[PDB]
From a paper:
Kdo addition blocks further polymerization while creating the epitope recognized by the carbohydrate-binding module of the cognate ABC transporter, allowing export prior to ligation to lipid A-core in the periplasm.
The WbbBGT99-D232N variant crystal was grown as a CMP complex, then soaked with a CMP-β-Kdo-generating reaction mix for five minutes before freezing. Significantly more adduct is apparent in the structure than was observed by LC/MS, supporting the idea that this adduct forms quickly, and then undergoes gradual hydrolysis with a half-life on an hour-time scale. The Asn- and Cys- Kdo adduct structures refine with α-Kdo in a very similar position, with only small shifts (0.29 Å r.m.s.d. for Kdo compared to 0.24 Å for the protein), with the largest shifts in the anomeric carbon (0.6 Å) and carboxylate residue. The most striking feature of the adduct structure is the dramatic reorganization of the Kdo group relative to the CMP-β-Kdo complex, with the C1 carboxylate moved furthest away from the leaving group phosphate, the exocyclic O8 group closest, and the anomeric carbon shifted 6.1 Å from the leaving group phosphate oxygen.
Author numbering:
A (entry chain A), B (entry chain A): 1 to 216, 219 to 380, 390 to 405
Write the structure that this text describes.
């Protein structure tokens, strides 16, 4: 079955950092799953000191589509637990900087981590033989090195750039890496000639919109800020930060022409003294007020591209290649492939039958057909997409 | 005379970034000064688009002790102007990141910058021969390399860690570097045996206090945040940031025991959702509520040390060596030397007669005597300091 890697290391000061994906896989589980995680994941619940975490909020559970697991739900899976001694040692090897330690976890092999993973996997039965694929919610060269030795693939899976309530929920599934080192551009290059999409970028954007767009005083430049310690601002940012992104824009625009939107999930908000601060209810209403958008690698950059805004992308990300194409035609085709073939309907990356489907490395046409079938729960590759858009049209 | 280096490069998006020091040297000038700067410094005034800058606020002028220069005041100095073409080229050589470019300016030689400096200095008269010393408000290996070739010293000068209205105004003057690569520890090591201070750390703190201390619900841990793009968070931080500093503390304390104070000058403030946020009127009232303090390299770390608080200093800074001494005795002696001999009364670093004094590299006893004479505008080195403290006592 699946071997789901959810490391317990509190790089950003939060225990069980990926608890929500632990609950989601448990909720959707149809067969037994091997969880490679930490005891923090198994004890967080019956810890009255953490009962206020957002993962326990009924609104968050309903939005992500999971329910809290019970004793029975968990008893049907196998659990391997990583110890904290390695984490303490890791911090001591990077000058006690937890963020730099996180960066090494995301971008370098850690031999001591590989040793413990091998030991855990070799600790029982034919655990290794039962493994059809690894799943990791982030890049992890330690795990990926172990996977090569054992002949297993690594699916990198995470929530996608389009999310409810504004959009249909999407997710990433990438065999090379998630956010950084992605294979979206490589997949597109191989089937680019198979795309003749009779729709505009706005039509593709409209297909994923679940709401009526906001009410269409422009700012010349909009600046998207991100969560300061998110993995793709730590590892895939090309050294840019929120503050150097702001300086970058101020080299090109006077502060009176800049509109800044802080990430609603950041610990930091902006003072009103310097820039004009955005107070929009959503990121779409914000970029609509801007003539061009600047981002490191926020999901919002995709929104700007799909709405036809001049967009600068300074960091590595899965959608950047769409922005690097000359000519409207190729850009629409690249966006269509990205949205219907690279992105996955959110629930499907937690579906074991779908994961087995992707493990066979099927053709892009079959992948698109699976996604549209799901989106359309109510022929060439372009025919599938053109007809899907057209049926949504009327 | 003096050759004052005030570069015009808007690394942080602000033109004439050190305009206030330009006005201060002009205001206190008794002789002709050579200014190596940019045209932005000379035109900012009669630019109605910048008349709201804080350097023009009468309260800021009175606090820093300068008045706006007029046509006559400036006509008695010589001006060399750096061009912007180099800045544009510099940005293109660091992936258009202005903050990374700033870092290179602070920490690396830039041959093209050295060439332009040499050309400017060689552009007229015996400009070079009239130069008694360079003054730089930041570390600049480009300028320091030029200085070596020409046989000139470089005084690194900046506002100090103790400032009005809470304290007597102080400044740095350091021949090796300011903030980073400082010589405070080296100077202390040479005369440590000459210090037998009959006062406590609180007594030294009281000497520089100009106000009555605040009214003495403790938090186990206080976190000092800094301005995100200040030079000593860009170049001398050992890679730490505000966000990794927070994670560092969260590895040791639960959020309920952490009190966070954002820098009043930062563009960012903190949300109320996670940590307990400090709303003190000053940094002293904040650290008084904490049992131990954490900082990268804020001036506030010195305050914590002088008030006897357990202090963690993660970045490079001039006062760190005080915190690395074992035993209360040596710590008080180190603090006394730092405060009376390393730190300079603010006005004196703009006084040409005092600068000439320091250019002779006098003995630590003479330096302390000059500073106490200034502080006391109303004998061994320890006798000078002990008597100064005692006279302030009664
Ligand atoms: N500056 C920002 C960044 C993100 N966001 C919201 O957060 C979601 C994910 O964004 P990141 O990839 O930037 O975390 C986006 O779809 C958008 O809904 C926002 O509203 N403003
Ligand atoms: N978190 C912080 C940082 C600085 N400060 C104020 O700013 C002045 C200089 O601090 P930095 O060296 O941190 O810029 C300090 O003396 C203190 O008065 C504050 O009040 N809170
Ligand atoms: O979880 C993270 O480290 C990050 C990964 C990004 O792909 C993205 O999911 C981001 C979220 O948008 C944070 O809200 O967090
Ligand atoms: O000006 C800077 O880059 C910095 C230097 C520090 O020594 C310190 O002066 C700091 C100020 O406290 C910022 O308010 O700014
Ligand atoms: Na991405
Ligand atoms: Na739609
Ligand atoms: Na310092
Ligand atoms: Na005093």
């Amino acid at each position: 079955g699946l071997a789901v890697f959810l490391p317990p290391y509190p790089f950003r000061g939060l225990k069980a950092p990926y608890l929500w994906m632990f609950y989601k896989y448990l909720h959707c589980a149809t067969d037994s799953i091997l969880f490679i995680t930490g005891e923090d994941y198994l004890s967080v619940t019956d810890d009255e000191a953490q009962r206020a975490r957002w993962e326990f909020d009924p609104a968050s559970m309903a939005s992500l589509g999971y329910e809290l697991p019970n004793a029975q739900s968990m008893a049907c899976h196998e659990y391997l637990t990583l110890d904290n001694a390695f984490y303490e040692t890791l911090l001591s090897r990077h000058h006690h900087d937890p963020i730099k330690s996180f960066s090494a976890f995301l971008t370098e092999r850690i031999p001591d981590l590989e040793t413990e993973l091998h030991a855990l996997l070799d600790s029982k039965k034919g655990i290794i033989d039962q493994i059809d694929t690894f799943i990791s919610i982030c890049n992890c060269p330690s795990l990926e090195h172990v996977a090569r030795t054992l002949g297993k693939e690594v699916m990198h899976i995470e929530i996608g750039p389009l999310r409810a309530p504004m959009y249909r929920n999407t997710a990433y599934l990438d065999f090379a890496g998630v956010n950084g080192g992605t294979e979206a551009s490589a997949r597109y290059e191989k089937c680019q000639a198979e795309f003749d999409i009779k729709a505009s970028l706005g039509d593709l954007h409209n297909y994923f919109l679940e709401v009526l767009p906001p009410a269409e005083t422009h700012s010349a430049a909009g600046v998207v800020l991100q969560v300061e310690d998110n993995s793709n601002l730590i590892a895939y940012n090309h050294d840019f930060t929120n503050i150097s992104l702001l300086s970058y824009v101020r080299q090109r625009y006077e502060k009176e022409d800049i509109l800044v939107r802080a990430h609603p999930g950041s610990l930091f908000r902006l003072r009103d003294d310097v820039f004009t601060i955005d107070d929009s209810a959503n990121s779409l209403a914000f970029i609509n007020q801007c003539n061009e958008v600047f981002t490191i690698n926020s999901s919002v950059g995709l929104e700007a591209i799909l709405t036809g805004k001049k967009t600068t992308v300074l960091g590595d990300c899965s959608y950047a290649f769409i922005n690097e194409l000359a000519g409207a035609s190729a850009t629409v085709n690249a966006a269509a492939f990205y949205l219907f073939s690279y992105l996955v309907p959110f629930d499907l990356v937690f579906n074991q039958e779908y994961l087995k489907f992707r493990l066979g490395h099927p053709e892009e046409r079959e992948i698109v057909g699976k996604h549209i079938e799901f989106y359309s729960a109510d022929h060439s590759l372009s025919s599938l997409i053109n007809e899907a858009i057209s049926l949504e049209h009327h």
